[PDB]
Design a protein around this ligand. Structure first.
Ligand SMILES: [Mg+2]
Ligand SMILES: [Mg+2]
Ligand SMILES: [Mg+2]
Ligand SMILES: [Mg+2]
Ligand SMILES: [Mg+2]
Ligand SMILES: [Mg+2]
Ligand SMILES: [Mg+2]
Ligand SMILES: [Mg+2]
Ligand SMILES: [Mg+2]
Ligand SMILES: [Mg+2]
Ligand SMILES: [Mg+2]
Ligand SMILES: [Mg+2]
Ligand SMILES: [Mg+2]
Ligand SMILES: [Mg+2]
Ligand SMILES: [Mg+2]
Ligand SMILES: [Mg+2]
Ligand SMILES: [Mg+2]
Ligand SMILES: [Mg+2]
Ligand SMILES: [Mg+2]
Ligand SMILES: [Mg+2]
Ligand SMILES: [Mg+2]
Ligand SMILES: [Zn+2]
Lengths: 167, 145, 100, 63, 143, 141, 82, 103, 53
RNA sequence: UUAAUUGCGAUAACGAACGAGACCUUAACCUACUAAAUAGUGGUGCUAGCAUUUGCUGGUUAUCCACUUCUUAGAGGGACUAUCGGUUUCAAGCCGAUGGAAGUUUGAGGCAAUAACAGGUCUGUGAUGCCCUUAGACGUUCUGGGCCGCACGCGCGCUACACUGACGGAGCCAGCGAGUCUAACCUUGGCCGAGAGGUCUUGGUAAUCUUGUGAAACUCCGUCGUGCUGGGGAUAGAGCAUUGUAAUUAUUGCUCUUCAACGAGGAAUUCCUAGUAAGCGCAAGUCAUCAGCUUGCGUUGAUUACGUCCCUGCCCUUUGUACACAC
């Protein structure tokens, strides 16, 4: 018994809160987005990741944990919410995943140029038409400066950016 | 399309409530010259006295002027509804008056005196000569006097 | 039997696909209907200063959400009713079925 | 200004280079065969290409 | 040929009908007349003051003859106007409600309008006849 | 049945629908004859097509106009546009085409916007100003 | 407080408010010879007020001395009838 | 009612009569720049005529009892005759004299 | 105690806060999303709000 | 030559990429498609009034019938400077006219390159390194004040200095939008109240109800009459209401009274080329209440260029430089 405007902005805020929760929790598992398909009899939540085995855990233990967390937080009834996991197609064609990989490499201690060029090589090997990586901040000094690593050609203007570019 | 010539008893500036009221202008906005009397009050009393409002104040009779003065001096006696009045539920007696030419200044002044001797905020403000209705003083009332 | 089906999506293509499959189902079952009535797509606007802080040229940004609403009226028995609510589901498309 | 870009001009040059015993001095049928014989994403660009092909065929009819 | 309120200018009809009502002298005037402004946004009361209730009533009668149903809210919206708020910018303020309410009550008692379903007031049969005849004479005054 | 057409005249945000059938020559506007459009001068602005083509061409037909949107001037322009377009539609469907040509020629020779709507539309409002093109005021010191 | 102005006063005419027989018969003998008559004329000529001018115009048009050609409010336009 | 001619003939006569034919303009090479006299186009003549007439009527009807309409009538009639009492003709002759002096 | 949180928070800038940043200034209260304008600019494409003009 | 390193082309360069453009959204056309009591129209039933001689104006939810011109959208079409004439090495293109809904890249926007500023922001962030502080804490919370405080100086604005007008009556026309759930939102209608507003109900989770948002400027009739005047309405006194726990340095609204400067604004300076400036109001944002502000919407709708590089700046080339935090 809610207007459709507020219904849809609530759907959007729900998707956003779920995305933020999952990109904070499953960062070590290649979380590359989520889909939310509501339906009669339930709402299903399709996570798209790489390490689906680690997302599932043993006996679906972690999936059960996440279903329970989602239900308790969003006031769903037990059984009205379901979580599925899927191996994402084209791992190289996913910016969030490569960014998380860069993050973990730089935290483990790898060097900036090595990491960024590994990323761009993997992407352009994965059937892309262009990739760009920008690392900004304090790099071997106090004064901050950016480093743009790139291969192939990219676009910056127009609706083709919303269509093709993944940022 | 009314043209009556006139008879020469018309009078220029007249006197009432200790105010040199102007003739040669209609009676409502003429009576507005009296401090304490505005457009609404004067229109209303000139309606209740049944004097024609198309008439100029200098073209009127002493009995009409006295009727109007009597009305404005005790208006509630003539079915004036007690919310046209500038001093209602006054501050001391609880009755409803309507101050006029010099009583307006005297009453304002004794109000300020009450607040000053009470040392109320508005009285201190009036004494200092500042704004009292809570306005901002940073950019206005610079050459206020 | 007086059913209204309202679809309240943001995705015009998915909405029109749903409408098309519904109407062709009702047409191959040969059910009298009032065709898909398309209400005005309502635009939800939010205007915001582009900047977090206050300095700079006062640049404003209007974000929009277009909500597309369709409704179809059907005369239908309970079996076709229950199966129609069984099916005609796609992501991002919200449906409401009401009788009378 | 109504200056055409090199996308339009190259496309028209190719269409003339390999479809001359064909499209004529008429924008309408040149358009209706451009959408038949080329893959163009937008009607606006299709019509620009058709117009430039018509202009070039007018040029070709005289020398 | 037949005539109606819609075949004559509104000013002419309203003047004629207000004169008819003032001459008939039976409708009403509440008693707070010759005191009031007709609007919280107006600055002075009406200037005629030998009437103007009949003008308001004629305007309301024409309005309800045209329309289907109205209320005191609609009439306040219609007869309101720009309140000069001194040094601040103007603003729409709606008219006084007691005035139009008592106008409609008097029009009911004299039988020109009635209460209607779907709320509000509606034009009655004898009131429609009255306005039509007044319009006919308002038009053929010009002979 | 009776010979009947229905047309529309337009302006900024006003539209005037006009039913035109066969009748005895009554020209109404929302409830009322054509002589009460109420600017008192755009009345002469709306008489124009009648006065141009001759009132004999309105004797056999009934026109009834319903106007909504805009303001008084735009409503008048919509009314005259709708009247002219409905007359032309009637003369095109029921009368022959030569009369339509003569009528259209007269209307366009007097004024182009009698049959064709003005394509001028409001420019939107942009920030930093009270209007489309205007900016607020620049302060340097 | 510098004003940056001139503030030149005026002569302050004293147009009449109510008439007598002299102004009345002056009106009655001088509203002819006027090819255009209106409030502005009856104030730049005879020094009556604008209200008196309105009333006198209605009066004279009642009798028939001045012919009307358009009586739009805020601008009354009369000529002389011969 | 006054000046029983066609009033359209009157206004076009006014426009023709109060149209400045010669006017000045800054011409120079930089620091050496003067107000040199030049001809005036007919469209600018018409526009300046209308502007002068309307401005004179406006600032005449301002702060006085006469109306904008009769002030404009005064202006148009005096301009069609040639008066030197009208704002328009006075400005016209001023500009023409200045341009003559600055030839 | 009973004075720890005594003051009412039924209205005003204290009764609301962003569901993300827990901030009282700059709330978008339209359509019942209750997000600061900055976090809204961050999460708009996720929520379904986009720029077209 | 172009708005455009946009193109013609020339050519120690060739072939490419980014940006521009193309693209997306929106506004304008479709009496051609799909349809639609959540938008309309016509007719037929019932019905009111005037005329009566057919007719004119209206109302009418379970009267139906028919349709989609207006309204809504979805898929599509349409303009591409089309045709013609001039002008140009006679190429890109430009100018004019005709047609057309539309011929300033159709109009307005969104997106928007490389390189940078030691621009702003740690007071948006459970974004953050370092430093400081960390229990009589700079955490958190309660009460009360302040952020409004005023001899003055600047910036954005609102009101106005009046008749192209103020006032009073009538007439009377929009569009963008918002709205209640575990709540109390937008509120019609009836009654009371001068007014603000109060009260009894009602509809709407919304193309259906508020809302034809019966807006205002505007028009028509009258009053006023060049008088710091019925222009203007700050500054003050008193009272009545509403929001809120609480209004006292007035939250705001209303009534009466008081009725200040201001007589078109000096040196200076801002915005603007068509449905644009300007005038006019309306919705939303903030919001318990508080618009003089902003974001958008529409209503009425001018003058004047259609040009130049004189001032202020921008771009490219050549040129000089004792400059490189770079006149
Ligand atoms: Mg009014
Ligand atoms: Mg104003
Ligand atoms: Mg504007
Ligand atoms: Mg004047
Ligand atoms: Mg019927
Ligand atoms: Mg040619
Ligand atoms: Mg563009
Ligand atoms: Mg920050
Ligand atoms: Mg502050
Ligand atoms: Mg500013
Ligand atoms: Mg005033
Ligand atoms: Mg008025
Ligand atoms: Mg509307
Ligand atoms: Mg400047
Ligand atoms: Mg508000
Ligand atoms: Mg406050
Ligand atoms: Mg603000
Ligand atoms: Mg230019
Ligand atoms: Mg040298
Ligand atoms: Mg050096
Ligand atoms: Mg130096
Ligand atoms: Zn936030």
């Amino acid at each position: 018994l809610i207007s459709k405007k507020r219904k849809l902005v609530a759907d959007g805020v729900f998707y956003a809160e779920l995305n933020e929760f999952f990109t904070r929790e499953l960062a070590e598992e290649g979380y590359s987005g989520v889909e939310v398909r509501v339906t009669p009899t339930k709402t299903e939540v399709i996570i798209r990741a790489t390490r689906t085995q680690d997302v599932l855990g043993e006996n679906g233990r972690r999936i059960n944990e996440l279903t329970l967390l989602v239900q308790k937080r969003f006031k769903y009834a037990p059984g009205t919410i379901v979580l599925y996991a899927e191996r994402v197609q084209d791992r190289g064609l996913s910016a969030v995943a490569q960014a998380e990989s860069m993050k973990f490499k730089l935290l483990n201690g790898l060097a900036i140029r090595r990491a960024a060029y590994g990323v761009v090589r993997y992407v352009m090997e994965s059937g892309a038409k262009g990739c760009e990586v920008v690392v900004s901040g304090k790099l071997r000094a106090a004064r901050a400066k950016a480093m743009k690593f790139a291969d192939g050609f990219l676009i910056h203007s127009g609706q083709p950016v919303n269509d093709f570019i993944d940022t | 399309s009314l043209v009556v010539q006139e008879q020469g008893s018309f009078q220029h500036i007249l006197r009432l409530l200790n105010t040199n009221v102007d003739g040669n202008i209609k009676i409502v906005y003429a009576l507005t010259t009296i401090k304490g009397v505005g457009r609404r009050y004067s229109n209303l009393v000139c309606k209740k006295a049944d004097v024609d409002l198309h008439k100029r104040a200098g073209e009127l009779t002493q009995e009409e002027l006295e009727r109007i003065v009597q009305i404005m001096q005790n208006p509630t006696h003539y079915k004036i509804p007690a919310w046209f009045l500038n001093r209602q539920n006054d501050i001391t007696d609880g009755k409803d008056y309507h101050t006029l030419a010099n009583n307006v200044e005297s009453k304002l002044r004794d109000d300020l005196e009450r607040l000053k001797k009470i040392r109320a905020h508005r009285g201190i403000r009036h004494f200092w000569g500042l704004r009292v209705r809570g306005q901002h003083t940073k950019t206005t009332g610079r050459r206020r006097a | 039997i007086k059913i209204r089906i309202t679809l309240t999506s943001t995705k015009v293509k998915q909405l029109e696909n749903v409408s098309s499959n519904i109407v062709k189902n009702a047409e191959q079952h040969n059910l009298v209907k009032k065709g898909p009535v398309r209400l005005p797509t309502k635009v939800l606007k939010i205007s915001t200063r582009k900047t977090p802080n206050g300095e700079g040229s006062k640049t404003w940004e209007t974000y929009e959400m277009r909500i597309h609403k369709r409704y179809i009226d059907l005369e239908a028995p309970v079996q076709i009713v229950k199966r129609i609510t069984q099916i005609t589901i796609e992501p991002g498309v919200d449906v409401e079925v009401v009788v009378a | 200004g109504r200056v055409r870009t090199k996308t339009v001009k190259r496309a028209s040059k190719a269409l003339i280079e390999r479809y001359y015993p064909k499209l004529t001095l008429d924008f309408q049928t040149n358009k209706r065969l451009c959408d038949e014989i080329a893959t163009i994403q937008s009607k606006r660009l299709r019509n620009k290409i058709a117009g430039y092909t018509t202009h070039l065929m007018k040029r070709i009819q005289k020398g | 040929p037949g005539v109606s309120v819609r075949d004559v200018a509104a000013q002419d009809f309203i003047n004629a009908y207000a004169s008819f009502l003032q001459r008939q002298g039976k409708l009403e005037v509440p008693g707070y007349v010759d005191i009031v402004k007709t609007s919280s946004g107006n600055e002075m009361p009406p200037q005629d003051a030998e009437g103007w209730f009949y003008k308001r009533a004629a305007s309301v009668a024409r309005h309800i003859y045209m329309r289907k149903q109205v209320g005191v809210g609609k009439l306040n919206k219609l007869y309101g106007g720009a309140k000069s708020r001194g040094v601040r910018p103007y603003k729409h303020i709606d008219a006084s409600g007691s005035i139009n309410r008592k106008v409609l009550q008097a029009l009911e008692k004299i039988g020109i309008v009635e209460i209607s379903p779907k709320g509000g007031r509606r034009i009655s049969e004898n009131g429609q006849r009255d306005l039509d005849r007044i319009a006919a004479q308002t038009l053929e005054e010009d002979e | 049945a009776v010979p009947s057409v229905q047309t529309f005249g337009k302006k900024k945000s006003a539209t005037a629908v006009a039913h035109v059938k066969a009748g005895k020559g009554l020209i109404k506007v929302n409830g009322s004859p054509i002589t009460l459009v109420e600017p008192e001068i755009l009345r002469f602005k709306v008489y124009e097509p009648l006065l141009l083509v001759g009132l004999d061409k309105f004797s056999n037909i009934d026109i009834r106009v319903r106007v909504t949107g805009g303001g008084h001037v735009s409503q008048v322009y919509a009314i005259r546009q709708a009247i002219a377009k409905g007359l032309v539609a009637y003369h095109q469907k029921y009368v022959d085409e030569q009369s339509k040509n003569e009528l259209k020629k007269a209307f366009t020779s007097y004024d182009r916007t009698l049959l064709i709507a003005d394509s001028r539309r409001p420019e939107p409002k942009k920030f930093g100003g009270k209007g489309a093109r205007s900016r607020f005021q620049k302060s340097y010191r | 407080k510098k004003k940056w102005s001139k503030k030149s006063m005026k002569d302050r005419a004293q147009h009449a408010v109510i008439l007598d027989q002299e102004k009345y018969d002056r009106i009655l003998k001088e509203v002819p010879t006027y090819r255009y008559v209106s409030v502005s004329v009856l104030v730049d000529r005879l020094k009556i007020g604008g209200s008196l001018a309105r009333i006198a115009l209605r009066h004279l048009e009642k009798e028939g001395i001045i012919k009307p050609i358009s009586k739009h409010s805020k601008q009354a336009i009369y000529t002389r009838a011969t | 009612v006054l000046t029983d001619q066609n009033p359209i003939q009157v206004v076009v006569d006014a426009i023709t009569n109060t149209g400045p034919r010669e006017d000045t303009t800054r011409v120079g090479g930089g620091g050496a720049a003067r107000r040199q006299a030049v001809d005036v186009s007919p469209l600018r003549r018409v526009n300046q005529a209308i502007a002068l007439l309307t401005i004179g009527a406006r600032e005449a009807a301002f702060r006085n009892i006469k109306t904008i309409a009769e002030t404009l009538a005064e202006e148009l009639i005096n301009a069609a005759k040639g008066s030197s009492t009208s704002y328009a003709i006075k400005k016209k002759d001023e500009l023409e004299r200045v341009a003559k002096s600055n030839r | 105690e009973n004075v720890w949180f005594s003051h009412p928070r039924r209205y005003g800038k204290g009764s609301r806060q962003c569901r993300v940043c827990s901030s009282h200034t700059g709330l978008i209260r339209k359509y019942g999303l209750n997000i600061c304008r900055q976090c809204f600019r961050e999460k708009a494409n996720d929520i379904g709000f986009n720029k077209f003009r």
